[PDB]
Design a protein around this ligand. Sequence first.
Ligand SMILES: c1ccc2occc2c1
Ligand SMILES: [Cl-]
Ligand SMILES: [Cl-]
Length: 162
Amino acid sequence: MNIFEMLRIDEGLRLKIYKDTEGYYTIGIGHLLTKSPSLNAAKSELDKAIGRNTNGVITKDEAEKLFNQDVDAAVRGILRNAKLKPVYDSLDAVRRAAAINMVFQMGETGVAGFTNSLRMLQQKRWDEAAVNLAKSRWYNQTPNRAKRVITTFRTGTWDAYK
Ligand SMILES: c1ccc2occc2c1
Ligand SMILES: [Cl-]
Ligand SMILES: [Cl-]
């Protein structure tokens, strides 16, 4: 198991523009196109990201290409964030994957709001962090996914993904 497989499991793969759990236009492997309520705006953003007139549909390869780009950006974003980096540097390889998953999902900003959990993770107090992570909108809105990520930080293993 690795970050790519983990996210592929959490996000699925769709080749046609769709609305995510928050109702925002997305495509591929969880690639957010726009928060705008307009499909046209979404189709424009899509064409711009792919570099062609897509008509709201992309191929598997194009999807995987966006995904590669998005994973890379998440990681790089964590390493550039002064709040995040030190936490991430402190983690083992499995837990780093859980950290990337959360940023991929909610953005660096979204995560930057888990200040108390971050500190717990940094201190390696696993069970407590797990409990704190669960007291969040994130958990209440996407409970099954959150459970898997939370178990990952708790255990340091891929059991939730098997
Ligand atoms: C970067 C570093 C550590 C993290 O813990 C949870 C999210 C996250 C992101
Ligand atoms: Cl893009
Ligand atoms: Cl879920």
